[PDB]
Symmetry: C2
Subunit: 380 residues, 2 copies
């Protein structure tokens, strides 16, 4: 078939870079429409020229002239600003990688979703903070939503789409983070350098908040009762997640950690494509371990469950407070164990009404951040 | 309307597990024929329970017992080899082919030729007559669903209609009871020790010990999935919880994992393309705690190499290998040769008897017969 049209929102980050690596490696199969970046003008212009893209968009209006210059004498169109990001997402690409991080990516992601084509979703806030809204748009416009993160993609590959009732349970595997075998006592005094040893994501892995967030996203993605989800600690992180069917059969997605595997799955879907991802060598792996997550040592897991269980704006508030707490820890303003405490406090004192639009989500995120900062400061 | 089902070999373990699922869904399934080999009692009871249209006992000598057991019911009674084939041709939309040995080839092929759905458990069908069986499937648009653990696991992770997406198929293997035993010690293994297991047939136990069972599984997999032999890998995994895997071109490896309950793979073939609930236990990974993996040892288990070479050569080799193994294993159990002589006799037979590729089941039977005689001759010469 003719070249497929593709657009990458957030083309210079880790996910974006891995995406472009695959697109470039198979440029003969793709027609790049738009690529966007936040402030990385150099890598953006390079990616655009490297794929003969129709348009390149830099998020910060301040960098517009720089982008134009980098694209001087090029057929590549240059644009900038938040509105331009949304316009790029509406250019018509059949396949869109939504990898702009944060609430800043919500507008463009929803816009792409509303186009009703294929959207490979990497942005976490879309489902954690605006899950109901995003999934509503997906269903309304017949969009093909393909999850990009490791666990979600693994689940998707083992999930009976169009027959959710076939699922008995979904198992989200977790490495357990750097403190899987660390006592609360020694955890209380870990330094940011030891915990991250992006930092934010690393810290979420340490507190296990990342799994709580993954749980929430999976709930929106697969639409099955919360009680059917299980978190299983698996140190090696080779089994990326699993799905058990009513007949007892458990389908699992296993492999090397190369992100080009899940990205490649979403890019080729419903087909399959070659990627340079290494083939997992089980003989060298030798062993796989499994154990129950310690809810006592990582209260973040419980907060996330209670949040999604209650629904409404709880998840959005939780996610927002965590952003504040994590940054505070990384800035040595609080202790490691204070992160989950600040998130919990925030959830307790701030319970806004459920969002009806992204504007409401933006409002909730901003307020929760203010609330969290206040509690973080008034911490005894 | 109820889906019609026939179970060939309904009294063995597979048959019992198959009936378990059928009887929990009599509102969904209508039993046409049920067959057994010598267990008239079990056959008759099952037939009467499921209100089967016909029950066939393989052994002609037991025809009278069967008729008496069915007296008063509406279940038709039949017996003999031909009756099995006829039962398989009664028209069931779903047929469980579980008659073991070459004695199940005729009925299995007959069912396949009807072009509906056939859940395949009989091993000789693909080990000895793989080419013919797959040809029959292609000719009649038959839906062939593998029942055994590894094959069903592969099937659930396989890109049907897109074979080129496969990079490799990993057949997991427990490694058998002698997984960590040296060739030197294996040389001394006695029949009494080799058959020890946690009922299971002695032959099954020996094939597990020599890993011939794995070699045969590889042959079957080769015909079932139609991908290049070099794309197959055997991976020793003691726990046997991962039942097999398939790696795709993007690096993704899909695996089927679960408890050992055969109702899971059977349930999959019975409900296909849908899924049905079964009482199979949900694998508890926390209790499991650990999974181990290691490379197979082709030096210590030459049966694996023999299987590989037989497939590469194709033709009648697999059938010859299977028949020779039957003789060799029996000889070992009868204490006429040593444990390691089994694979040696098989190897010798494969080199000495090289008939033409089978063109019909009649040729397969002839090859099986001759291979058995040649193996026996070699077994005694040794």
């Amino acid at each position: 078939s003719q070249p497929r049209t593709v657009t990458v929102l957030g083309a210079t980050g880790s996910i974006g870079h891995s995406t472009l690596d695959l697109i470039e490696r198979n440029l003969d199969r793709y027609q790049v429409i738009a690529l966007t970046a936040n402030r990385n003008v150099k890598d953006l212009a390079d990616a655009a020229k490297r794929t003969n893209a129709k348009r390149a968009v830099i998020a910060d209006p301040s960098l517009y002239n720089d982008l134009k210059e980098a694209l001087a004498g090029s057929s590549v169109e240059a644009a900038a600003g938040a509105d331009a990001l949304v316009e790029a997402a509406m250019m018509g690409a059949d396949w869109t990688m939504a990898a702009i991080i944060g609430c800043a990516g919500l507008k463009a992601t929803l816009a792409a979703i509303r186009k009703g084509k294929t959207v490979a979703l990497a942005n976490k806030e879309s489902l954690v903070s605006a899950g109901g809204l995003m999934i509503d748009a997906v269903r309304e416009h017949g969009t093909t939503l393909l999850p990009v993160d490791s666990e979600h993609n693994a689940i998707f590959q083992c999930f009976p789409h169009h027959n959710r009732d076939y699922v008995r349970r979904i198992i989200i595997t977790a490495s357990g983070g750097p403190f899987r075998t660390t006592s609360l006592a020694e955890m209380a005094t870990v330094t940011p350098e030891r915990a991250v040893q992006g930092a934010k994501i690393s810290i979420d892995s340490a507190t296990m908040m990342n799994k709580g967030l993954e749980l929430i996203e999976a709930f929106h993605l697969f639409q099955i009762p919360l009680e059917k989800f299980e978190i299983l600690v698996h140190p090696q992180s080779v089994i990326h997640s699993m799905v058990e069917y009513l007949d007892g059969s458990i389908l699992a997605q296993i492999g090397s950690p190369d992100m080009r595997t899940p990205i490649g799955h979403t890019l080729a879907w419903p087909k399959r494509m070659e990627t340079p991802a290494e083939s997992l060598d089980f003989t060298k792996l030798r062993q796989m371990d499994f154990e129950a997550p310690d809810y006592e040592r990582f209260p973040a897991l419980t907060l996330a469950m209670e949040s999604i269980k209650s629904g409404g704006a709880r998840p959005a508030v939780m996610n927002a407070a965590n952003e504040i707490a994590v940054a505070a820890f990384l800035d040595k303003k609080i202790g490691f164990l204070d992160i989950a405490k600040i998130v919990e406090k925030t959830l307790d004192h701030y319970t806004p009404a459920t969002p009806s639009s992204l504007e409401d989500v933006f409002a909730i995120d901003n307020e929760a951040r203010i609330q969290a900062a206040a509690l973080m400061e008034s911490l005894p």
